[PDB]
Point group: D2
């Protein structure tokens, strides 16, 4: 499978979206799993999940790697509401447009906030919920905020450069030897190709600070069976938020990977793929 062979576009119409262009990459034809990426500069569905799409398709799922509004090849946007909710509306718009009745959701960081908001707003449209270090869940009981990684994420948004991208990635990943020229150049190309996304994200952050993303108080509403994953060494979203989710969602379990930053699906791809596929099949 390749980015080019899987690349598709769909115009969505949902709440404050009118003929809004959403890019996604699709492979497979069984039960739909939508995978949702984080909010760092240059993020997109394919680069976030290219170690997972193949195994999930082999397991018999239809995988949609969605570009969230204001990222990658999806349309530019300035949001005045918290991104989790807006992104979630875009997932519903995509699903309606493609006649998908129900989807399993996989979401890391911002994508985890998206998946949470979706499970809250559209409970009849979600199957199972897989959350990898979701962002915006309020203060940590131990970690000073903004977290180290978030500071670097802001700095890259405001002053984008190849060196700052590398600094960010070194914080993002536990194992530094995963940062090849291919990963760096690829992410750098996504940033260079869409400078408008960077300035818009910063404007959006002014209109709706991270505190506005905190849906903690509503977690008890979630009826989806939930699989929470965390990197032990995540410097972007605090480990104790894995416990917050585990205590507040009805049917949840928590899996924490050692020697792992925010990108468990990349750093521990084999174990991640087996666990989540097993959860989707049998939980």
């Amino acid at each position: 499978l390749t980015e080019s062979s899987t690349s598709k576009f769909v115009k969505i119409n949902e709440k404050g979206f009118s003929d809004f262009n959403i890019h996604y990459n699709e492979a497979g034809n069984g039960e739909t799993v939508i995978m949702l990426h984080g909010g760092g500069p240059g993020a997109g569905g394919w680069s976030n999940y290219y170690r997972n799409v193949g195994p999930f398709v082999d397991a018999g799922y239809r995988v949609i790697l969605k570009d969230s509004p204001g990222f990658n090849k999806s349309d530019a946007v300035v949001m005045d509401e918290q991104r989790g909710l807006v992104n979630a509306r875009a997932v519903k718009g995509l699903m309606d447009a493609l006649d998908i009745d129900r989807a399993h959701l996989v979401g890391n960081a911002m994508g985890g906030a998206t998946a949470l908001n979706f499970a809250l707003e559209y409970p009849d449209r979600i199957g199972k919920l897989i959350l990898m270090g979701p962002g915006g869940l309020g203060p940590s009981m131990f970690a000073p905020m903004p977290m180290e990684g978030i500071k670097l994420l802001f700095k890259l948004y405001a002053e984008p450069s190849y060196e700052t991208l590398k600094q960010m990635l070194q914080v993002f990943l536990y194992d530094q030897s995963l940062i090849t020229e291919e990963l760096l150049q690829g992410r750098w190309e996504a940033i260079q190709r869409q400078p408008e996304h960077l300035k818009n994200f910063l404007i959006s952050a002014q209109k709706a600070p991270l505190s506005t993303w905190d849906v903690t108080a509503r977690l008890g509403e979630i009826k989806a069976k939930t699989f929470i994953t965390w990197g032990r060494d995540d410097r972007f979203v605090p480990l104790d938020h894995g416990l917050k989710l585990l205590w507040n969602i009805d049917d949840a379990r928590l899996h924490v990977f050692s020697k792992c930053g925010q990108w468990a699906q990349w750093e521990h791809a084999d174990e991640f793929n087996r666990l989540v596929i097993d959860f989707l099949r049998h939980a």
Copy 2:
């Protein structure tokens, strides 16, 4: 499979053990997995693991559910050293006696301490290590000690009664409806059948307090791939010890079950069996 059809005995000879009788239950004939039980009154291999033995045997393993010294049908003993280490020596004695070169270990509570000590003392004789809320790992950062469950465990040892057994089990299990007459009577029979074990455990606890079981300082020695499981609602061993293990063992991962006490292999048997079998096969 039944307790009676699987029941076996072997005399062990290791360090301070001479012709010491060890009871165990064995089924299957592939790779050996030894499963080790907790230290509560009436504990034994078969009752601790009777929801897991079948699935593991179906997966192709040879399962040995071991009675630790001073429990169930194994010989009576008063230990002056911490139980984890003494139990571990008994596992080595059993393995030598049965010509088992290497075993995967599964250990809950006291059995988790046993498995840890084994991995430390006999690294060449362990495959993978599965730890379910191991006891004796020093103070908690949050939980006052002795933990609620430990107080009840002591009270049952000192003043054994059917009502006190029921109180203990209600604390042991998250889901109270799992406490059937069959579970209660069975555990009660094990207590009635071997009163000597109860008095000996209390004597042993005087000679070697729980503080003496703490092997935290040596966790960095463990080279076994390790799967740590915890019940979110464990009132016997503190949840933050799952983090302690995850930070200090080289290759570890942590899985926490919601709505689960100390007995994850019983309360969440299906998920537990799938996760651990997958870990043994693929990690």
Copy 3:
């Protein structure tokens, strides 16, 4: 100072209170400090704070040890709303009735919930806020709930007995040698004297469960300078809630006493008195 010489009554009129009798003990004549007790069977202002009233009066404060509605010598009541808020309304009623414009509040456990609700509802009427292990602040990130102490509190409410009172107190206090016959008999007399309070508390708990007391989401509203105290060994309210308060209240500090249960003002009275008096004078 004695309970009898300080004992006073006042009829209050506030929201759902009409000619409702509030008992309190008052000494001193400077700045008013109102001290608010926990919700255990037989609790009251004088017994909760009799090691603190003298030192605070010597420091120049007017101390009012308030009996909350449905406790001690205050009127009986069945509450259908969370107790923190109802208690807080009663504090306002007392203050209006006595022409007290502003008070410093000291609150342990339920009394801490009372003080929090007061700071939220009547910000113009509070000086400084002193919180000792306040109850009802939602789930713990580490402690299974109901906490051990809460289970005993329920059992004493439902099946009051001298032995069960002693069991509760042994959990309540770190240092068991503080449980003299005088403390036990005194608390027992308060329970025997007002059986109606016990049945009413249980009825109230059915109408408004502990989950309904959780004011976490509003903590950011508190403008009072806040001093949070915790017992390290508190088995009633979880230590991580001290962090929850410290992260969410604007101007807070946290002091944790070693070898201390829920009753820091009793177990560490000298240090407690010096710290809080210093805070009231200088913070």
Copy 4:
């Protein structure tokens, strides 16, 4: 009081120190309190504690602000043993040289490690122990290591520059408006004046990594009454280590300041001074 008027030197002779020059600043003449600074580039006694020396002297103490070996105006040194222990030996050498029988110790970060090692090695020579976010106490249960602040500390040691110093200080302090030109230039002058200290610290860190400083296992030996302080927002040493100390030292208490980095004695100087002076007088 000024740095110049208080500045003194003494040659020490203790274990591996022979005629080793120690600089310190001394004022007052009552009970001796020795204050020990952190290990960041340009650290020294006077700059670390210049908001505390006056109030402590006014309270009646003799204050010695010690420069640790390899810092400020004390002699250069390359250490092959963990710095806490070596620094502690230097404190004993200073005390012997000055005929001080017993001292109260105040230690932040590295200075907290120094004070801990001193309390362990020379229990007969310490009064009370005041610890402000001591470093080197092993892994955190929540914080990835090296902590954000430590990474910046290394970067400043390796590539010293005024901009990198400012970056470090912005992380060091919660309130950025405390970073005046005076603080920056002063710290910068200390770095420029002694480049040898920077290269030696890095060499020492290679010979004795931070893991070698971990004295956790011996904390139970400490008989000194201990006051542990932490900044809630400390990005150099993890907040859960405050709990580690509180659980493992016999007579300890923990005070956590909101809106505070590693430098509580500077950011919350008034409250810090009152608390510690009160502790020294009355605990």
